[PDB]
Structure formats: structure tokens, C-alpha cells
Amino acid sequence: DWRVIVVVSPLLIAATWAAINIGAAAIRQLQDVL
Amino acid sequence: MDRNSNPNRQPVELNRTSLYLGLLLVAVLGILFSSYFFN
Amino acid sequence: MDRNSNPNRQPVELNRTSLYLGLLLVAVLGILFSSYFFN
Amino acid sequence: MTPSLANFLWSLVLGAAIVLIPATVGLIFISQKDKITR
Amino acid sequence: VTYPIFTVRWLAVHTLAVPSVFFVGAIAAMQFIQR
Amino acid sequence: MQVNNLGFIASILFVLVPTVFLLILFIQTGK
Amino acid sequence: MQVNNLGFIASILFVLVPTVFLLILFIQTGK
Amino acid sequence: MESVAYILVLTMALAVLFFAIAFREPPRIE
Amino acid sequence: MESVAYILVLTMALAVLFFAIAFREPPRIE
Amino acid sequence: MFAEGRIPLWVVGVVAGIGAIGVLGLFFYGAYAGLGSSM
Amino acid sequence: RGWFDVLDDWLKRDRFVFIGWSGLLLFPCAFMALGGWLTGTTFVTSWYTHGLASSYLEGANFLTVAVSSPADAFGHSLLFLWGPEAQGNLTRWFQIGGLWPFVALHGAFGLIGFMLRQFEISRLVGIRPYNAIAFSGPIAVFVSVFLMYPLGQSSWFFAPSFGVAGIFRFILFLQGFHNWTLNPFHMMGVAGILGGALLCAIHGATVENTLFEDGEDSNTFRAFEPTQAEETYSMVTANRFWSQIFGIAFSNKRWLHFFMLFVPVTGLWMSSVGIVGLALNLRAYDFVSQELRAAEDPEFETFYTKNILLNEGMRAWMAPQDQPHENFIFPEEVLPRGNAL
Amino acid sequence: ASLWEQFCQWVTSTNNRIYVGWFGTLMIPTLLTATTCFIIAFIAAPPVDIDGIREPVAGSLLYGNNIISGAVVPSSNAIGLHFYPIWEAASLDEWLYNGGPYQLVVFHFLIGIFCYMGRQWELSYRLGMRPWICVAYSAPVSAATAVFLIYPIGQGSFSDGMPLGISGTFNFMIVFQAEHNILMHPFHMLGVAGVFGGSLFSAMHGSLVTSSLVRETTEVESQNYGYKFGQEEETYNIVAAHGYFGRLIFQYASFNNSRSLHFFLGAWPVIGIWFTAMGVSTMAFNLNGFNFNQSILDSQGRVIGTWADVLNRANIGFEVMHERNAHNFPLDLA
Amino acid sequence: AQRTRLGDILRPLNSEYGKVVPGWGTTPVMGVFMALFLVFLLIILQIYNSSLILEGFSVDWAG
Amino acid sequence: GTTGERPFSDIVTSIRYWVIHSITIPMLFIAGWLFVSTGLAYDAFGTPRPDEYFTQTRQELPILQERYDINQEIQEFN
Amino acid sequence: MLTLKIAVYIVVGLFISLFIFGFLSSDPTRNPGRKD
Numbered sequence A: 001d002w003r004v005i006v007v008v009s010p011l012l013i014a015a016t017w018a019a020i021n022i023g024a025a026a027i028r029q030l031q032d033v034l
Numbered sequence B, C: 001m002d003r004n005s006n007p008n009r010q011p012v013e014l015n016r017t018s019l020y021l022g023l024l025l026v027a028v029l030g031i032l033f034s035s036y037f038f039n
Numbered sequence D: 001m002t003p004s005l006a007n008f009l010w011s012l013v014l015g016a017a018i019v020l021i022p023a024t025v026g027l028i029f030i031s032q033k034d035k036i037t038r
Numbered sequence E: 001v002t003y004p005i006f007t008v009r010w011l012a013v014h015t016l017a018v019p020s021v022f023f024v025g026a027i028a029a030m031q032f033i034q035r
Numbered sequence F, G: 001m002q003v004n005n006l007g008f009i010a011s012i013l014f015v016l017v018p019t020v021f022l023l024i025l026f027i028q029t030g031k
Numbered sequence H, I: 001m002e003s004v005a006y007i008l009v010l011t012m013a014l015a016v017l018f019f020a021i022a023f024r025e026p027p028r029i030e
Numbered sequence J: 001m002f003a004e005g006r007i008p009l010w011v012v013g014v015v016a017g018i019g020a021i022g023v024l025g026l027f028f029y030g031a032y033a034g035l036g037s038s039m
Numbered sequence K: 001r002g003w004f005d006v007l008d009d010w011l012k013r014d015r016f017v018f019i020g021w022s023g024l025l026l027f028p029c030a031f032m033a034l035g036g037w038l039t040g041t042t043f044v045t046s047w048y049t050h051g052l053a054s055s056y057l058e059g060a061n062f063l064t065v066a067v068s069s070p071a072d073a074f075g076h077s078l079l080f081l082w083g084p085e086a087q088g089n090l091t092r093w094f095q096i097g098g099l100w101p102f103v104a105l106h107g108a109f110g111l112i113g114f115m116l117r118q119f120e121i122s123r124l125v126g127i128r129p130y131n132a133i134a135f136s137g138p139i140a141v142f143v144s145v146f147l148m149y150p151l152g153q154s155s156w157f158f159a160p161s162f163g164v165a166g167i168f169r170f171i172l173f174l175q176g177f178h179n180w181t182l183n184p185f186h187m188m189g190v191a192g193i194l195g196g197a198l199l200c201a202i203h204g205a206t207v208e209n210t211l212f213e214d215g216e217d218s219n220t221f222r223a224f225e226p227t228q229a230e231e232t233y234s235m236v237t238a239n240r241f242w243s244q245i246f247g248i249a250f251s252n253k254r255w256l257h258f259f260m261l262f263v264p265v266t267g268l269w270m271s272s273v274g275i276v277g278l279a280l281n282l283r284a285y286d287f288v289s290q291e292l293r294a295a296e297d298p299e300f301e302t303f304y305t306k307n308i309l310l311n312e313g314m315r316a317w318m319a320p321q322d323q324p325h326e327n328f329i330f331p332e333e334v335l336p337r338g339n340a341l
Numbered sequence L: 001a002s003l004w005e006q007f008c009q010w011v012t013s014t015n016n017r018i019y020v021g022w023f024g025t026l027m028i029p030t031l032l033t034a035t036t037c038f039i040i041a042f043i044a045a046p047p048v049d050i051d052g053i054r055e056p057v058a059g060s061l062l063y064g065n066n067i068i069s070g071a072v073v074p075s076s077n078a079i080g081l082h083f084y085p086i087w088e089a090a091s092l093d094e095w096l097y098n099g100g101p102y103q104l105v106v107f108h109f110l111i112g113i114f115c116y117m118g119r120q121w122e123l124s125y126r127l128g129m130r131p132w133i134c135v136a137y138s139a140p141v142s143a144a145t146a147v148f149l150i151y152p153i154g155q156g157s158f159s160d161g162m163p164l165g166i167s168g169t170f171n172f173m174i175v176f177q178a179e180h181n182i183l184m185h186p187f188h189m190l191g192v193a194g195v196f197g198g199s200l201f202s203a204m205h206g207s208l209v210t211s212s213l214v215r216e217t218t219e220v221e222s223q224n225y226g227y228k229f230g231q232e233e234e235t236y237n238i239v240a241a242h243g244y245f246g247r248l249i250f251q252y253a254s255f256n257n258s259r260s261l262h263f264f265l266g267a268w269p270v271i272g273i274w275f276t277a278m279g280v281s282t283m284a285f286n287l288n289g290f291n292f293n294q295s296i297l298d299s300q301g302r303v304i305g306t307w308a309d310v311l312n313r314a315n316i317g318f319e320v321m322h323e324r325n326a327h328n329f330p331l332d333l334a
Numbered sequence M: 001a002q003r004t005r006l007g008d009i010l011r012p013l014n015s016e017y018g019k020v021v022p023g024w025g026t027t028p029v030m031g032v033f034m035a036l037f038l039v040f041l042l043i044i045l046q047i048y049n050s051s052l053i054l055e056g057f058s059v060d061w062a063g
Numbered sequence N: 001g002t003t004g005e006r007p008f009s010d011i012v013t014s015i016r017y018w019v020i021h022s023i024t025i026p027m028l029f030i031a032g033w034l035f036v037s038t039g040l041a042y043d044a045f046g047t048p049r050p051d052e053y054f055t056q057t058r059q060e061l062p063i064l065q066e067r068y069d070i071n072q073e074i075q076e077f078n
Numbered sequence O: 001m002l003t004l005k006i007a008v009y010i011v012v013g014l015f016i017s018l019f020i021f022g023f024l025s026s027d028p029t030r031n032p033g034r035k036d
């Protein structure tokens, strides 16, 4: 269903925005805690 | 006026034998009079 | 066998305030439930 | 073997796999990563 | 200073706030349904 | 049997009240 | 009024028995 | 005669009130 | 139901007897 | 604004509060329009 | 260090949200119950179970949305998503009222988890577990009302619906069909709740108005320190005030606070007992002596008999819509009503 | 010195077992009058024609009532809001038949409770306390005034005051719901929050204090004996209580200031009861609870039911039966 | 501590006060039996509840 | 008194939080919006649309009556 | 009835006058703190 695609795409976009703006420090923290 | 402790007050006692005697008296009086109370 | 005094026995207490509270509780429970007992 | 029997057994299996033992695995993993330093 | 970013508190916050904002968007949209 | 409708209350109180009087006096004895 | 014939005994005992329980406990207190 | 029972229990409660006020255990600072 | 009352009072007397024998105040020479 | 690198917390509070007021205002508006408005 | 000790350490770490072992039960079940209620009130209808709209999507508001009880046709079926009714169909599961047992059961286990949490945290910090004991009251209410009452009745349909107006409907239903106000157990519940509110108000005010002068500000709130050893208000002054105003007063702080626990908790427990009775239609509905007298004396009228008439009216007018599965057809002429109304 | 001064020092004396005070000089007579009349009427008052239709309602124990069903019946609808003291009746029997005892008891009781609130202020002033316990008591006073005076005033008759009885109270509530939908009134919802939350906070506060009691006794005696009246030290560990509660929910939701905590305990139920008293007082002017009857229509225009419609059905069932002989005309406006 | 003949007969049964198995002991097996008990209770509940329908019988007075 | 986590005020007054959230929060808002406005919610939850409470053949409340075959019952209700 | 009305009027007037003149008798002075 296309309705599924258009209801999901905002969620995905929020996910990628958060990732691209937090990922360096998030991976830093993940590695530090091993 | 002032409330002063009363020095005439005394303990009351009922020893165990007196308890048994009184309980028996009460029980037998009940046995006796219950039939007449019911009539 | 011998009858030895039991060292676990303890006094019970009910202070005056506890007496008033219990008497009031009993009285109000009676007030509440008497109508239903009579029906 | 009725459909409701199959669904009950499937409920046991899926309850385990979906809740009981991703949660146990995750809890064990994290407790052994972030460990209290005495 | 220099605290962790993701924590149990982070997850507790989002587990609530994320569906909350989703639901609020849904209800806002409902405000414009016509019979 | 058509007995007096106050018989049960009369008999029970007739026994009960002196019973609790004696019980009170005995239990408090030695206070 | 046609009330339950056990109402008087039930109510009176309902009050009386806990009353004497409390009275016994209070009066003996300090023994 | 159930009126008697009602009056009885109500009077019991009221008497308890009067005794609990007049003959209360005095609060004492010690 | 007055049979219940009769049985009750008789049982009260008998219980008093058993307690007065078994749990009597011991006579003690002193 | 008054300090560089961070938003004042009162500004954030004002903005979030206005957003919340707008959300509740939209819900109250919808009480009178569309579904559930008795019209 | 065994794996169990390591897990125990991680679960009991001092963090913003304590987890504990009880959290393993509390947080998923509580989240399920809350999210189920929110989902149902936002999206899910009661059209097929009750013939009612009960979601925001249908146009209902906060006061009228509910997670409605399931259809009476299912009796006391637990209505698992995988159960013989829904058979794994989520849409159908929503439509038959499957969300109601979902919320009720997850809420019951969440309540268990929360009380286990009270026990666990009390044990960890080294205090007595009287908070959990106090919480037993709300648990008794939830168990009696949301589980035992429908279990004694024909089905889950007659359980309260999780909603504001649904609860109001349950309340009025119990008045009209059970005469719940006449029930002595409910009156003890009311006494406990109103007494708890009274104790809360009077204790708060008494403390706030017998405070010691421990600061110089008109703002008395910062003349207290959590580590201070002395009482912040005068118990002696409070006791004198209430003794002279009311006749009696607390003199023991510990008894005072135990009483503040005792009153509402006992109220909840007594009302739960009454609800258990109503589950089996064991009502305090009537006073038979007054019924008989009124039946033979058409001039005997009391407030009790007037309330009986009100209940009859409510039942007749409400049953066809409240119980649609019964197909009650009450023609206009059989409806009781007074003159001109 | 002077006789009047001596009397003033006696009335305002803090050494009296029961404080009298100037408000007490009104409270005591009015409250005693109300109590005596209430007891006499509740036991032995003859039936009262509350609805003014010559349909007397038996309220007293001697006329067939139990404690649950007994009441002091509100005065007749024919009286309306007229003042009906004993001396305006042709005889005591007429006064009784028209519900005069209700007016006597209610008016004296209301004066008494307002004077009780003033007396609370007065004693707080004489003892050097802060003055606001009476403010808390103003909530129950507001509620009682709403149900005994304000609602009859707005409705235009003391027959529509709350009866002085248990079953009479229930009748009052049921009719009130039928006519005003008080359950769907937000002020009554605030009252429910007030009392539910007040009981909740009473249970939490008592349980947290009891939970954090400092060990001062043995396992035999009551822990209550660990507290001595007038002791300076604190009897429980508020820091331990805060640790427990701030871990039960989270740190910043827990009071650690006892003064703020007790202010919250006072304020929550008082505010809730003020709101519910105002709810009754404004429903006295027929500003009723929310009406969502037929608020949801389908696309064609057929009404879709909600729980509010079921509630309305129950209300109608109550409405058509209440005071079954009193209405002549189709609309229940009075 | 009065001795009686029956007391001496019963003495070895009340002699192991407080003796424990160090560590976790049989706790895993206990947990396994508890899980099996839970599944059993679920089965009989769902049968009684008519949420688990088996062939060969009906939950009804007729059997 | 901090249990270790960063204080909320510090996080929500920081620029990075707002760079993240001026996007994330509106996206969930309009995702819920689109959930409603596309009709997905109706089909997912089985909630009738305003024109589907009644059909041209069913004018009465579609109250479920059968104990185990509700799928077919709902289908015949339409 | 008239005797009753007069008696009640006198009783009520006396109690009200008591309350009024009592609060006029320098009542703010009757406190354990400051008397200015």
C-alpha cells in the first residue's frame, strides 16, 4: 500500500536526520562502553 | 477549681474460684429460668 | 511429666483512647448494619 | 490437534521468542557490558 | 560534563514522547474530518 | 412451638450480662 | 413493620460482644 | 420495636462521644 | 429454636464444670 | 540570544507552551466543526 | 561474579528511572495497558460490540471515548489475539473488543509489578513496606470491579469500559440495577474516601498553620531543611487547638499518620467486598418490611421507596440501548413514568 | 476589672476546655438548637408534604423508617422560599406537616458552621497560630451551603434542598444527576479528583511516614509508643522517605520539603471541594454538565451513539419517574 | 526440653535445622518445574475458558 | 544529587537538541496526520468511516452475536 | 405563637448583641503576641 509508504517516510526521515546529527558521538559512546 | 486525686479508691478482685462459682450460678439460673422465659 | 511455667506469655494492653476508638467503631458499625439486619 | 491448540502452542513459542528471550539476551548482554565497579 | 547521550532515561522519554506526538498529529488531522 | 417471642433475647441476655460482669472482674484482678 | 425476627438479637450481639471484648481488654490493662 | 434498637445504637455512639471528650486521656508533655 | 437456647445453657454449665476441674486454682500449702 | 551557544530556557518554555495552547485550541475548535459537532 | 549477580547489579543501578527486577513485569505490562487504552480511545470503535462510537476518529471527545467492553456473545472469553474468536486477525480483534481484556490483564499485571516495585524499593532503601500495603487498596478495587464483577455476571460486556463516560455509565448502571448506594459496604467505602480527603485537608492545614518561626521570610517554605532533626510545626499547639475546637485531638504523630493510611485503605477494601457481592447479584436492594407495608398501605412513602421507583425508571428506559445484544423491545406504553413527563 | 471586661476575658479565654469565643457565642446556641430539633424530628416527626401535593413523606423512625431510610424531610414545595418559622404556623401540627423542622434545623446549622469557621480563626488568633485552618474548613462549609441553601435558592424552593437523611441524600443525588448531569460537569470531576486524590495523598503520606519511622520500640509494643507527645526531635526519617519515593517514580517528583508537602496535602482536597461546591452552586442556576446527546452523526445524518447517549438514557429514566405526581406540564422547569 | 518416647522417635526428623546446599543448588530444576506448572495452568484455564478447544469433549454439562 | 544523566534543562536548551528535534518532532506530527488523512487508520483498526456505519441493506446496529466466527459475521455486516 | 416569637426575638437579639459588643471590646488586643 502506498499509504504505508507515505506514512512511514516521515518516520524514516526523522531517523536519518537524528543519525546524521548524532552519529559521531553515538558511535563514540558505543565504542567506549565496548 | 482543682481536680485532686481521690484517695478512697480501691482495687476490686474476683479470684478464679469465685469466677467458676459465679459462672456456674449464672449458667444454672439460665437453665432454670429459660423455660419460663419461653413459656 | 512436669508442668513448667511458659516464658513466652506477655501482657496485653488497650489504652483509653483505643477503647474510645473501638467503642465508637462498634457503635457506628451497629448503626450502619442494624437496618440491614432488620430488613 | 485443533486450530486453537496450534494457536496456543504458537502463542507459547512466539511469546518466548518475541518477549521472553530477546529480553533475557538483552539484559544479560548489557549487564555484562556496563558492570558496576566496586 | 560529557554525559552519555543514550541511557535508560532516554529510552523512557522516547517510548512515551514519540507515539505521543504521532497520536497528537493523528488527532489534529481528525479535527478536519467531515461527515 | 408458639413460645414467647422475647424468650431468646431474655435468656441470652440473662446469661450473657452476668457472664461478662464476672469475666471483666476476674480478668482485671491483680491489676 | 414485619422485620426480620432475628434482627434484634443480631444487632444487639453485633454491638455487645465487641463492646465487652474492648471493655475486658481496657479494664485489665496495667495488670 | 426496631425503633428501640436504632435509638439504642445511636445513644451508644453519643455516649461514647461525651466520654471521649469529657473523660479523655489527658495529653501530657513529658 | 428454643431447643438451641436450652442446649446452649446446658453446654455452658458443663464447660464451666470441665474448666473448674481441669483448670482449677491449685490448693497450695503455704 | 542573551548568551551565545544556547537558547534561554524561558524562551523554550514560551515556545512549547504556545504550541501546546495551539494544540488544545485546535481540539476545542474541532469540538465545533466536523465530526462530533452535532451538525 | 555469577551472571545472576551481574544482572541484579544492572537492574538495581541508581538511575533516573529505577528498573529493578519488578520492572521486568511492570514496565512492559504497564506500557501495554497504557498504549492499548490510548490506541483504543484514539482509533477503535465499539460499533460491533455496543453499537457506539468510542474513539476520537469517530468524533468522540475525551469525555466520551473509551476502550469498551467486549461483546456479550463471548461470555468470559479472554479474547487472545490468537484466540478462537479473532484467530490472529488484528482488525477483527479490535472490532470484537479484544482491546478491553488486553488493557485489563496488562493493567492487572502492571499493578502487580508496581506493588512488587514498592516492595523492592522499600527493601533496597531500608524502610518498612507500608506503601505497598497501602497500595493493596487500589489493587482490591481494580480486582473486584474490573475482574470479579464481570466474572460473576454473564460476560465481560458488563465490566466497566475504560473511559470517562463509560465509567459514568457503569456507575449509573450499578445504581439502577443493584441499588449500590443502599449497600452498606459502599457506604463504608464512601466514609473511607471522604474521611481520607478530610484527613488530608485537615492535616495539611494544621501543619501549615502551626509552623515554627524558623526563618525571616514571609515565605515560610524555605524555613525547613530535610536533614533537620527537630519538628517543623508545633504538635503541642495543634493538639491544644483541636482539643478546644473539636473536643479531641491527635497527640501521637505516629498514630496520626497510620490513621491517614488506615482510613482510605479500609474504605477501598470494604467497597471491594460490596462489589464482590454485586458480582453475584447479592444486592442490598430492598428493605422487605417497607416493601410489604407499601404494597399493603398506599400512603406509606419514604425516600427509600422513592429511590426504588427511580431505579425502576432507569432500568426500563436504559436497558434497550445499554444491552443491545438482548434485543429488548419495550413499547412506549410499557415504560414507567410519572404524570405529564 | 469591670463586669463586661471579666466576661470578655472568660469568653476569649484559652484555658476553657472547649474554646468559646465570640463566634462561639453564636455557634453554641444555634448548633445546640439545630441538634436538638434534628434529633427530635428524626425520631418522632410526623410525615411531611415535601412536594406540596398533599402526599406526605414519612421521615422519622417512629413512622416506619430505619436509620438508613429516615430523614428530616425538606419543607413543602408550596412554601417555596418563604420563611416558615414556628410562629407563622396556625399550630405545631401544621408546622410539622409543612416541613418546618427542616427550615429550623438547616438555618441554625448553617449559622453554626459559619460561626465554627470564624471560631477556628479566633482560636488560632488566641494561640498565636497562623490563621488559615478556617480557610481549609471553608471547603466543606461551601459544599454544605451549596446543597442546603444555594441550590434551593436557585431552584426556588427549600423542598429542593438536600434532605437530612441517608436515603434522602441518595434521592437528592439521583434527581440532581437526572436534571443537571452532574457527572458530566467538570467541577464535579474536579471534586472527584479532589477526594480521590486527597485519599491517595493521605494514604501515601501516612504510609511513607509510617514506613520511615525511627526505631524506638521493641517488636512487642506498638510502634506508636516510639513517639512522645511534645518531643522536639523528628519521629520519622524524611530523607529516607524521599529516597524511597523519588526512586518509586523519579527524583524530581518527590517532595523533600515537609512544608511544601503539607501545603500540597492541604491544598489539593480543599481546592477540589471548592470547585465541586461551585459546581453545585452553579447547577443551582441550571448551568448543567456537558450535553453530548446526538453529537456524533454519520454521513447520512443518523445519530451514532456514544456512552454519553447511554448516560442520557439513564438520566431520562430517572427524570420521568422522580416526583411522579408533582408535574402537570411537559417541561420540568421548576 | 522434656523427653518423651514419641519425642525420641521423632527426634531425627527435627534435627537438620538450617542445613542448606551451598550456591544455587537445584534452583534451575525448580524453575523448569515452575514453568511447566504455569503452562499446565494456562492449558486448563483456557480449556475451562473455552479459549482452547480440544477434540473429544465439550466444556458443557453434557460432556 | 544527579543519578548520572545529563540534566534535562541543559539538553533542551542546547542547539544540537533543537537541530535534531525541529525536524524529528514535526515529522512524527505529520506522520500521524497522514495516518489519519490517508484513510490508513480506518482500514488498520476496522473503524467505520462516517458513511459505513449503515449499509443500504443493514439499517440496524451490527451487534455481534456469534461466539467463534466473528470474521464472517463482520463480513456479512459490511 | 406570639409569645414564642417575642421570646425568640429577644434571645436572638441578646446573642447577636453579645457577639457584636464582644468583637468591639478591643478584640485585636486579645492575643498572646503584640498588643501595640
Ligand code: CLA
Binding pocket: E016, K141, K145, K164, K167, K170, K171, L183, L188, L189, L190, L192, L193, L194, L196, L197, L198, L200
Ligand atoms: C484503572 C482505573 C481507573 C483510572 C485510570 C481512572 C482515571 C480517572 N478517573 Mg475514575 N473511576 C474508576 C477507575 C479509574 N479511574 C472506578 C472503578 C470508579 C467507580 C466506578 C471511578 C469513578 C470516577 C468518577 C466519578 C470520576 C473519575 C475521574 C477520573 C479521572 C480523574 C481521576 C483522579 O484524579 O483521581 C485522583 C488521582 C490522582 C490525584 C493521582 C493522579 C492520577 C493520574 C491520572 C496519573 C496519570 C499520570 C500520567 C498522566 C501518566 C503518563 C505517564 C507520565 C510519566 C507521562 C481520571 C482520568 C473523574 C473524571 O471523570 O475526570 C474527567 C471523575 O469525575 N472516576
Ligand SMILES: CCCCCCCCCCCCCCCC(=O)OC[C@H](CO[C@@H]1O[C@H](CS(=O)(=O)O)[C@@H](O)[C@H](O)[C@H]1O)OC(=O)CCCCCCCCCCCCCCC
Binding pocket: D019, D020, D023, D024, D027, K001, K002, K003, K004, K024, K025, M022, M023, M024, M025, M027, M028, M029, M031, M032, M035, M036
Ligand atoms: C520480559 C521479562 C523477562 C525476564 C527475564 C529475567 C532474566 C533471567 C532471570 C533468570 C533468573 C532465574 C534463574 C536464577 C539463577 C539460577 O537459578 O542459578 C544460576 C545457574 C547456576 O549456574 C552456575 O552455577 C555455579 C555454581 S552454583 O550455582 O552455586 O551451583 C555458579 O558458581 C555460577 O554462578 C553459575 O553460573 O545458572 C544456569 O545456567 C541455570 C539456568 C536455569 C534458570 C531456570 C530456567 C527456567 C526458565 C526457563 C523457562 C522455560 C522452561 C521450559 C518450559 C517449556
Ligand SMILES: CCCCCCCCCCCCCCCC(=O)OC[C@H](COP(=O)(O)OC[C@@H](O)CO)OC(=O)CCCCCCCCCCCCCCC
Binding pocket: C015, C017, C018, C020, C021, C024, C028, H010, H013, H014, H016, H017, H020, H021, H024, K245, K246, K247, K248, K249, K250, K251, K252, K253, K255, K256, K259, L018, L224
Ligand atoms: C464543638 C466541640 C464539641 C464536640 C462535639 C463533636 C464531638 C466530636 C468528638 C470526637 C469523638 C472522638 C471519637 C474517637 C475516640 C477518641 O476519643 O479518639 C481520641 C484520638 C486521640 O488519639 P491520640 O493521638 O491520643 O492516640 C494515641 C494512641 O493512644 C492511639 O490510641 O483522636 C483520634 O484518634 C482522631 C481520629 C478519630 C476521629 C473520630 C471522629 C469521629 C466523628 C464522630 C462520628 C460519630 C457520629 C455518630 C452520630 C450518631
Ligand SMILES: CC1=C(/C=C/C(C)=C/C=C/C(C)=C/C=C/C=C(C)/C=C/C=C(C)/C=C/C2=C(C)CCCC2(C)C)C(C)(C)CCC1
Binding pocket: E016, E019, E020, E021, E023, E024, J020, J023, K031, K032, K034, K035, K036, K038, K039, K040, K102
Ligand atoms: C494497542 C496494541 C499494542 C500496543 C500499542 C502501544 C503500546 C502503543 C501505543 C501508544 C501510545 C503511548 C500512544 C500515545 C499517546 C498520546 C496522546 C494522544 C497524548 C496526549 C495529550 C494531551 C492532549 C495533553 C495535553 C495537555 C494537557 C491537557 C495538560 C497540559 C498541556 C498538555 C499539552 C500537556 C500492540 C501493537 C503492542 C499490540 C496490539 C494492541
Ligand SMILES: CC1=C(/C=C/C(C)=C\C=CC(/C)=C/C=C/C=C(C)/C=C\C=C(C)/C=C/C2=C(C)CCCC2(C)C)C(C)(C)CCC1
Binding pocket: J010, J013, J014, J015, J016, J017, J018, J021
Ligand atoms: C505560564 C507558563 C509558561 C508559559 C507561558 C506562555 C505559553 C505564554 C504566554 C503569553 C503570551 C503569548 C502573551 C501575550 C501577550 C500580548 C499582549 C498582552 C498584547 C497586547 C496588546 C494590546 C492591548 C493590543 C491592542 C490592540 C488593540 C486594542 C486593537 C488595535 C491593535 C492592537 C492589537 C495593538 C512558562 C513556560 C513561560 C513558565 C511556566 C508556566
Ligand SMILES: CCCCCCCCCCCCO[C@@H]1O[C@H](CO)[C@@H](O[C@H]2O[C@H](CO)[C@@H](O)[C@H](O)[C@H]2O)[C@H](O)[C@H]1O
Binding pocket: E028, E029, E032, E033, E034, E035, J019, J022, J023, J026, N037, N038
Ligand atoms: C500547532 C497545532 C496545530 C498544527 C496543525 C493544525 C493545522 C491547521 C490546518 C492545516 C490545514 C488543514 O488542511 C486540511 O487538510 C485536510 C486533511 O484532512 C483536508 O480534508 C479533506 O480531506 C480529508 C482527507 O481526505 C477528509 O477527511 C476531509 O473531510 C476533507 O475536508 C482539508 O480540506 C484541509 O483543509
Ligand SMILES: CCCCCCCCCCCCO[C@@H]1O[C@H](CO)[C@@H](O[C@H]2O[C@H](CO)[C@@H](O)[C@H](O)[C@H]2O)[C@H](O)[C@H]1O
Binding pocket: D006, D007, D010, D011, D014, D015, D016, D018, D019, D020, K081, K082, K083, K087, K088, K089
Ligand atoms: C509475556 C508473554 C506475552 C505473550 C504475548 C506476546 C505476544 C504473543 C503473540 C503470539 C501471536 C500468535 O499468533 C499466531 O501466530 C501463528 C503462527 O504464525 C499464526 O499462524 C499462522 O501461521 C501458521 C504457520 O505459519 C499456520 O499454521 C496457521 O494456520 C496460520 O494462522 C496465527 O494465525 C497467529 O494467531
Ligand SMILES: CCCCCCCCCCCCO[C@@H]1O[C@H](CO)[C@@H](O[C@H]2O[C@H](CO)[C@@H](O)[C@H](O)[C@H]2O)[C@H](O)[C@H]1O
Binding pocket: K039, K086, K087, K088, K089, K090, K091, K092, N044, N045
Ligand atoms: C500501534 C499499533 C497499531 C495496531 C496495528 C495497526 C495495523 C493493523 C494490522 C492490520 C493488518 C491487516 O489486517 C488483516 O488482519 C490480519 C492481521 O493480523 C491478517 O489475518 C490473517 O493472518 C492471521 C495471522 O496468521 C491469521 O489469523 C490468518 O492467516 C488471517 O486472519 C489479515 O491477513 C490482514 O489482512
Ligand SMILES: CCCCCCCCCCCCO[C@@H]1O[C@H](CO)[C@@H](O[C@H]2O[C@H](CO)[C@@H](O)[C@H](O)[C@H]2O)[C@H](O)[C@H]1O
Binding pocket: L088, O002, O005, O006, O009, O010, O013, O014
Ligand atoms: C433584644 C432585641 C429586640 C427585641 C425586640 C423585638 C420584640 C419582638 C417584636 C415582634 C413584634 C410582633 O410582631 C407582630 O406580630 C404580629 C402577630 O400578631 C403581627 O400581626 C399581624 O399578623 C398576625 C399573624 O401572625 C395576625 O394574627 C394579626 O392580626 C396581624 O396584625 C404584627 O404585624 C407584628 O407587628
Ligand code: OEX
Binding pocket: L051, L077, L155, L159, L160, L175, L179, L322, L323, L326, L327, L332, L333, L334
Ligand atoms: O421538587 Mn424536588 O426536582 Ca427541582 O426539577 Mn421540578 O422541582 Mn421537583 O420537578 Mn424535577
Ligand SMILES: [Cl-]
Binding pocket: K306, K307, K310, L171, L175, L321, L322, L323, L324
Ligand atoms: Cl423522587
Ligand SMILES: [Cl-]
Binding pocket: L326, L327, L328, L329
Ligand atoms: Cl408542573
Ligand SMILES: [Fe+2]
Binding pocket: K203, K207, K257, L205, L209
Ligand atoms: Fe505529616
